[PDB]
Amino acid sequence: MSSTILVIHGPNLNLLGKREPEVYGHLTLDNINRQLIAQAEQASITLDTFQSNWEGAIVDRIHQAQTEGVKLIIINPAALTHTSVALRDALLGVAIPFIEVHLSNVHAREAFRHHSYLSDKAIGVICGLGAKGYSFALDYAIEKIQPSNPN
Amino acid sequence: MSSTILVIHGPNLNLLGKREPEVYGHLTLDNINRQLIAQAEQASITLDTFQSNWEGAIVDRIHQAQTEGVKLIIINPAALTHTSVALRDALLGVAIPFIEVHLSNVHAREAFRHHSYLSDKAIGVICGLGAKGYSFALDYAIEKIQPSNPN
Amino acid sequence: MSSTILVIHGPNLNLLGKREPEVYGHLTLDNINRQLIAQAEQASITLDTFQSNWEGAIVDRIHQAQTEGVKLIIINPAALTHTSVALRDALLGVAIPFIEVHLSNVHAREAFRHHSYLSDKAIGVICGLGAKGYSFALDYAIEKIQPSNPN
Amino acid sequence: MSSTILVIHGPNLNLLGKREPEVYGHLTLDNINRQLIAQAEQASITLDTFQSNWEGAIVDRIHQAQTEGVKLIIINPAALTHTSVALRDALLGVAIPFIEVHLSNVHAREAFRHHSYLSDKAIGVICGLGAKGYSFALDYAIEKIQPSNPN
Amino acid sequence: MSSTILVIHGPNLNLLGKREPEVYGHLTLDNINRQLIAQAEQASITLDTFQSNWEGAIVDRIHQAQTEGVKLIIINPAALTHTSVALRDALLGVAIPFIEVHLSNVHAREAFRHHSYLSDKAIGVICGLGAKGYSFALDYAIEKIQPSNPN
Amino acid sequence: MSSTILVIHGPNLNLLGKREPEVYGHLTLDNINRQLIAQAEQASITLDTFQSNWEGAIVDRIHQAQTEGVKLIIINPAALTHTSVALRDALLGVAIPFIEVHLSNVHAREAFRHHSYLSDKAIGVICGLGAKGYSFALDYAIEKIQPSNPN
Amino acid sequence: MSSTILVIHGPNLNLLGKREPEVYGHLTLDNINRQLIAQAEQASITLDTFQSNWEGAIVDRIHQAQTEGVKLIIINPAALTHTSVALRDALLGVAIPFIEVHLSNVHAREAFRHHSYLSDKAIGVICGLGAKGYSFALDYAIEKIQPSNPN
Amino acid sequence: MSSTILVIHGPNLNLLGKREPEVYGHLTLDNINRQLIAQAEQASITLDTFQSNWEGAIVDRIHQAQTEGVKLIIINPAALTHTSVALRDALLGVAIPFIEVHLSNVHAREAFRHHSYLSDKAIGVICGLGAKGYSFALDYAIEKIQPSNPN
Amino acid sequence: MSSTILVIHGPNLNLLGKREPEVYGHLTLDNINRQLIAQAEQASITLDTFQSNWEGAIVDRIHQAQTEGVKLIIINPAALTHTSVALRDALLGVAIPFIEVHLSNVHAREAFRHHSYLSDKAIGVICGLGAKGYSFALDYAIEKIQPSNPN
Amino acid sequence: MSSTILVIHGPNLNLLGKREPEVYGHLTLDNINRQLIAQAEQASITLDTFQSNWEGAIVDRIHQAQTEGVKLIIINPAALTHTSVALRDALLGVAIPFIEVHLSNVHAREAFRHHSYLSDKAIGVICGLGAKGYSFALDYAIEKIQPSNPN
Amino acid sequence: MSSTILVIHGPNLNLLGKREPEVYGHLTLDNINRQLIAQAEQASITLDTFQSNWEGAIVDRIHQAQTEGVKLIIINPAALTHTSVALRDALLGVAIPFIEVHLSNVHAREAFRHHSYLSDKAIGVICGLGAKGYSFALDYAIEKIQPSNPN
Amino acid sequence: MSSTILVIHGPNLNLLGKREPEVYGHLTLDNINRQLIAQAEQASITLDTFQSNWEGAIVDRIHQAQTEGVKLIIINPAALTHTSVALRDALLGVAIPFIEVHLSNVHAREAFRHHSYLSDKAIGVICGLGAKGYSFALDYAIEKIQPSNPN
């Protein structure tokens, strides 16, 4: 079995691009996923994506990732970062390294958003850089997996 | 189908009237819905109702509400009020105004029940008035949506 | 005078509808009292109202209520809700059940407004529903003050 | 008017005399005052008593005490003990030593009752001994003002 | 005629023994369930088991337990112990007494693990004794439910 | 010439200057008011003053200020600054800008004196500068009310 | 002995009157004990006394009190008041009502001295009244057992 | 052969099965000890027992256990659980593995009972299962000392 | 420089009026200094000013002030108010009395701004009155150094 | 289409690679700067770098950035992130948008490291991805300044 | 009985060098005492030493010290440092100046070890320097008690 | 050339002996350094000393110390101990073992002084022993660097 990256999107992320005409639209979750997939293909890495509003579905997906041989996870937990011990335990239980990504700056909002049950065990965290944040996580992930020289 | 007002009941609310009715009352969640649907009919307002023990299902329902053009949500999040950021983010993400309702007086109970992830963003909150709390919320909602005669 | 229901308004409620709206509505404390009195009259319920900026005067009114045979109090303590143990102790002392009402949503403002010396002992709490909150409390109260087949 | 000893009863204490807030056990405020006055007369010591539900009235009384040359105050602040820095400041401002008395045991009830704005500045505190707590305070005060042989 | 005792395992428990058996356990969740079932039979007690990564599924199972007349629940809530009031509310709502079990010593890991939404309402708690903890809980339940010995 | 400034003195401020040679000297509250009145006179500004030990009296006075056209309030809340939300709400309610003054340095005393319900809504705060603090507030007020250029 | 009333002195109380009899003057623990024994003898009530610096010795004495049929304990736990749950459990375990006494005013000293493991369970508390606090406690106890009354 | 397990009962446990300790359970401490001894004897393990109300005696006993080569300790610290660092340091100092046991459910009682100075260092913890908790701890301990296979 | 006064401005104060002078105002730090120097000239008092972004420079300047015979310091520590113990220690070390000034109202901004390492040791604090704050501080200082309140 | 990006490195960053590679040795501060400078050159964007151990030097540099017309700051504050209000105020004062970068994962180390005086005002935050974090920040920054490209 | 300097060792210190000496070090408590006695003899000061696992025994020893004429106490309270108010009160009660010593660095260990009931009242504290810490304390004590000048 | 042991004095330490010679003490920073340098020469160890009021200068000096080959640092950070993470990171960055010294007892002064950013990483801490504390730290260092048991 080989090296795959898995991108996990948490609850409410499916909403992206419904705001549309000005404040945040028109960009969508599928648009993000499509860019990442292209980015991965360009490096000859198999990338899969998942989104759910259900915490249990996310946990199940992480469990499947281990059996599937996934090497690294890029996860935007969204609201679940502040609340889900089960998510943290699933990631730890499978021992697949992960990078935490947030489109918005979690630190610029309510104080409860400062707390995370994931960040302390993540390799790294990116927030506030929008969709580029996932790309950055992917770029890092590729180097870690297929290190240094490609030529 | 399509709807103007949506009533959402959180986990365990389905238990109402189901254990020791002589002690705890015969009123069921179904009775509450029946009462509200009739109250809604009196105003020619289309009312939908939803209950689940699963957070993800509630979130999905809320997303569905945006597509349906629901104008207001009446929600009793039950236990989820103190724990679910995901729920708060769904409501905020679809930008549908809501009224928070609890059968019991949350303040009269454990300290952890004092905190809500919804209350600060609600139009208003009602607790401790039992089933009538939902009716009052419905009365307020109808007036806001189709203003008529003030009292 | 003897009354079955007493409505108490706390400090600064006299200002309502005074600095014109904008800043809020034309609704006045008098409009609310008028609306409540009519609602009680329609139910053949005798209702009295009271407002003051003086805490001791409020405590005295509650003491008076006990002698007047008042069965339930609907109180908007306003600012006193966060500060007055004397108010809580008066209500407990006369042992008259009460409903707490706020026009605005107490939870949507400063952190200090989250806390109350009354809420845990109230039958129930209504906030953020404007004037209608008082009407809802009155509606509940009339229903409670009815059967007496209880003991 | 120029008493040696002043006994101040705080808010809601009048309810002992008007018919018990809880309570134990139809001992009235007037009964307490009579006992203290007799105890004071027996020692040839002049004593006055005061009760109010109003913070300002209490503050004014304390100021009046200064002009009257009161040497010690026995005060049962009741609910005010937990809230009134204005009371603390009146007492410190006039520099009259005081003993704090509570009929009930303030530590045996809600956590908020554990805190006082007075107790740190009192000579001493008595709580939970009922009416007898005032008598003890008076006995201590008499010995302090009019020392005699061991008591 | 379904079961007398129900054992619930929380999220991530399905992973037990999954990777990599040489470091840490060989033992699996099915191994645990088989031992408990054997232990139950030996006592002529009907025992059922359930595991899920979804909170709602567990809540549904608990509600189902009431309908089946389950006398006692042995639950390892895992991560959910620190986060789910919904779980707490389900167990209370059905009013089925429970014993809380953890394989590992919850107190020996991060501070957040110290807090439980279940422990205070449990009959008892066992942590850190591994698989034997479930057996111990069963022993206790059997004696409670069918206290074989007259005494 | 319409512009009017109102100075409010809170509880216990009436005591200023009683123990005269040592305790806090000879300056009285009346002395302070005379100086302020004269300072106002020089600037062609109308100024009124008020003191009370009763919170309700102060709140009423503020409400009266709105109707009297008062432009700005200089308030020394004294002990009320730490306790009275009602006071905050009256000032906010009439929307009259205010400056908060204390003779003593609040920060230099008990930790509870560090907190205020007024300071965050004041234009500014002055403490620990004695009676001059009021003059400074007046100087600022006069300039804000009738701004001056080079001359 | 057996006795009806037991007075317990906690650690360091043996020091009273030892150092700089111009520090706290000349009163000793024995002086206090003699005064109490005499006060008890007037009532024909048998009183025992005990002091120790060892927590276990105090717990053992309390247990002994139960067998001896002591009806009330007057206890000055001294330092143990802030630290010993074992003391709290002994008193509750034997179910002998108690009054807590401190010579000094506990609230006037370090913050850590503000918390007691006994006060919430005591009948009453007296502090800051010196040696007289023990006499007051004894007078209350005697009256509880063998009441006399003017009123 | 040849193995000793030591059971330590902390302060106030001597009261068990008497009259009115807080929770009257029928079983005495001796009854508990006799059951444990029999259980150990079945495994050809020696079971030492110790109870004291004195912390120092317990600390000395632990030191003694090290000199005597005790394999494991089962300890119910009772009230000392929440207060004694010295106990934790004794167990750590001798490095004898231990299991912490409580008859009652520590989590169900005052918040101060929630904290243990031993739990984080224990192999495991059992609480609220009454006398059976000690037996369970012993069963685990024997298996740890004497793994079944091969004798 | 006799009866010298020293004015110290902390980090970032150099920016005053630099950016968006419309919108934010055009008063500059130099303008403030020139005003203070002139105000000082009028009273025949020597005054110096200092600003730095460097804590060490400020500490050195304070040390220098003692040797220079500076009699009072007027300081706006800016950001350093909430972070520098070193500043507090420098001012305390030289024993030069000081007044703390801020242009803006520190209490109306983030919670972290509510704490000062200076305020408890200043004679007084002025905040939120802008440039005039420095002038008021100077006005007080002159009276204190060279009192001419009386002609 | 050329602009100015400024990279700021905080205290102790100058140590990178200077001891015991591999601890995580080898990579130096200059190596990071060369990579960034090269990365900027490829975009035809002008980039400057600064490192210092002195907070004042950093504050000065940031002020200079304003005069220089710097568009965006990429800053690794290092230790200053948890301590420097002066730094926060400098960036806000000049109003230059910034991205916060940390080589290591701040969330994975002592609790004090979890708090930043910058993060809430940052566009975004990157931590734990090492040197790459700076490049990602630069990539985002380039797109921000010069959006229109072959992309 | 009779010594100028008294060294007190708290609970568990008797274990030093007891187990795994090769692992943990061979130094024993007697070795430490022997060094100190020798250092004392060199300076012609009498020194006594004491160790116990019982708090009461330590308190009694301190009391004895007053009568003995001890001038200074060097105490390593060990675990009792974090828990014993009684110890603090004993030292204060006899008013013997003391120095607090710990072999290990308390600040490097769990958070609860960061608080001492003695540190605030000690002349000084030494921790983490092992046995030498006692010697340093002794060196300071000698210089304090006896004039530096030999002969 | 270069030192083996380096002594660092923090901000304000330069003031020692400057003011209040009779009240303060007339020992200066130079006296301490000369004593240390002599103590060092006496063991044939080179010792360098440094003081600054500038955190950056201190950090730079520590960096220099690594390249110099300094074996150990004795540091009195003074006020910086409570605020300077940069200082902690410098000492850790160079990996030079350090002992933390304070002339005064930090524990006896404000609560904020109780926390240190160095203490947990120091070998040891000495405070409150005046100048001797530095000498004691040196004595430990010399023994650590050149032990005399090998000899």
- What does G91-118 look like in DSSP terms, one character per residue? HHHHT--EEEEESS-GGGS-GGGG--SS
Residue A125 C-alpha, separation from nearest chain J C-alpha, in angstroms:
6
Best residue in I9, I13, I15, I109 for a mutation probing chain J (most J CBs within 10 Å): I15
CA nearest D144 in G: which residue?
G129
- Rounded CA gap, E112 and E83, in Å? 10
I118 touches chain L (CB under 8 A): no
CA nearest J116 in I: which residue?
I112
D124: phi > 0 → left, psi -120 to 50 → alpha, else beta; which? beta
C-alpha closest to that of C134 among C43, C2, C11, C6: C6
Chain A environment of E29 (Cβ under 8 Å): none
Distances from the Cα of L103 to the Cα of C32, F106, L16, L72, angstroms: 69, 31, 10, 19
- Rounded CA gap, B3 and J117, in Å? 46
C-alpha closest to that of D21 among D83, D103, D108, D76: D103
Distances from the Cα of A46 to the Cα of I54, J115, K148, angstroms: 52, 37, 80
Phi and psi at J85, nearest 5°, equal -65, -35
Which tokens sit at L22?
Answer: 């009779």
E116 touches chain H (CB under 8 A): yes
Chains D and C: 3 or more CB pairs within 8 Å of each other: yes
Sign of CA dihedral E58, E59, E64, E66: positive
Sign of CA dihedral A100, A103, A108, A113: negative
K59 and G19: CB-CB below 8 Å? no
Chain H environment of E99 (Cβ under 8 Å): 129
**Residue of D9, D102, D117, D134 marked catalytic:** D102
- Rounded CA gap, J107 and J82, in Å? 12
C-alpha closest to that of A140 among J40, J132, J28: J132
Angle between helices J55-67 and L55-68 (to 10 degrees): 120
Angle between helices D132-145 and G132-145 (to 10 degrees): 150
> Do the annotations mark residue A89 as ligand-binding?
yes
Instruction: Output Rg (C-alpha) for chain C, integer angstroms.
Output: 15
Instruction: Please name the amino acid found at residue E121.
Output: K
Q: Are I102 and I76 in contact (CB under 8 A)?
A: yes
Nearest CB to J56 within list I18, I19, I54:
I54
* Sheet of K124-127, strand order: K47-51, K5-9, K72-76, K98-102, K124-127, L124-127, L98-102, L72-76, L5-9, L47-51
As assigned by CATH, the class of the A1-151 domain is: alpha beta
Chain D environment of C83 (Cβ under 8 Å): 83
C-alpha closest to that of G10 among K79, H83, K86, K94: K86
Chain B environment of C129 (Cβ under 8 Å): 99, 123-124, 126, 136, 140
The H-or-E segment that residue B94 falls in is: helix B85-94
The H-or-E segment that residue B99 falls in is: strand B98-102
CA nearest H88 in K: which residue?
K79
Q: Are L60 and J53 in contact (CB under 8 A)?
A: yes
Task: Give the bridge partners for G75, in sequence order.
Answer: G8, G100
Chains C and L: 3 or more CB pairs within 8 Å of each other: no
Task: For C60-120, give the secondary structure using H, E and C.
Answer: HHHHHHHHCCCCEEEEECHHHHCCCHHHHHHHHHHCCCEEEEECCCHHHCCHHHHCCCCHH
* Burial class of residue G44 in the structure, from the number of CB atoms within 10 Å of its CB (0-12 exposed, 13-18 middle, 19+ buried): exposed
- CA end-to-end span of chain K: 26
The H-or-E segment that residue G58 falls in is: helix G55-67
> Is residue D114 flagged as an active site residue?
no
Nearest CB to D83 within list C57, C85, C90:
C85
Q: Are B14 and E63 in contact (CB under 8 A)?
A: yes
**H25-39 b/e (C-beta count within 10 Å ≥ 16 → b):** eeebbeebbebbbeb
Question: Binding site for substrate, residues of B?
Answer: 76, 82, 89, 103-104, 113
Cis peptide bond upstream of D25, omega within 30: yes
Q: Which residue has the tokens 């009352």?
A: B25
Nearest CB to J11 within list L54, L66, L89:
L89
| Tally of CB atoms within 10 A around E92 | 16
> Do the annotations mark residue E60 as ligand-binding?
no
A122 and J128: CB-CB below 8 Å? yes
The coordinates were experimentally obtained by X-ray
Give the side-chain half-sphere CA count within 13 A for A82: 22
- Rounded CA gap, J73 and J80, in Å? 16
Q: Which residue has the tokens 């070795």?
A: K31
- Rounded CA gap, K79 and D120, in Å? 31
Task: For H4-56, give the secondary structure using H, E and C.
Answer: EEEEEECCCHHHCCCCCCCCCCCCCHHHHHHHHHHHHHHCCCEEEEEECCCHH
Chain L environment of J56 (Cβ under 8 Å): 56
E112 touches chain B (CB under 8 A): no
C-alpha closest to that of I137 among I100, I105, I104, I106: I100
Which tokens sit at A62?
Answer: 């992480």
Resolution stated for this PDB structure, in Å: 2.0
Sign of CA dihedral L13, L14, L18, L22: positive
Chain D environment of G135 (Cβ under 8 Å): 151
Chains I and H: 3 or more CB pairs within 8 Å of each other: no
Cis peptide bond upstream of F100, omega within 30: no
| Tally of CB atoms within 10 A around G34 | 12
Q: Which L positions 85-104 lie with beta carbon below 8 A of chain J? A: 85-86, 88-90, 93-95
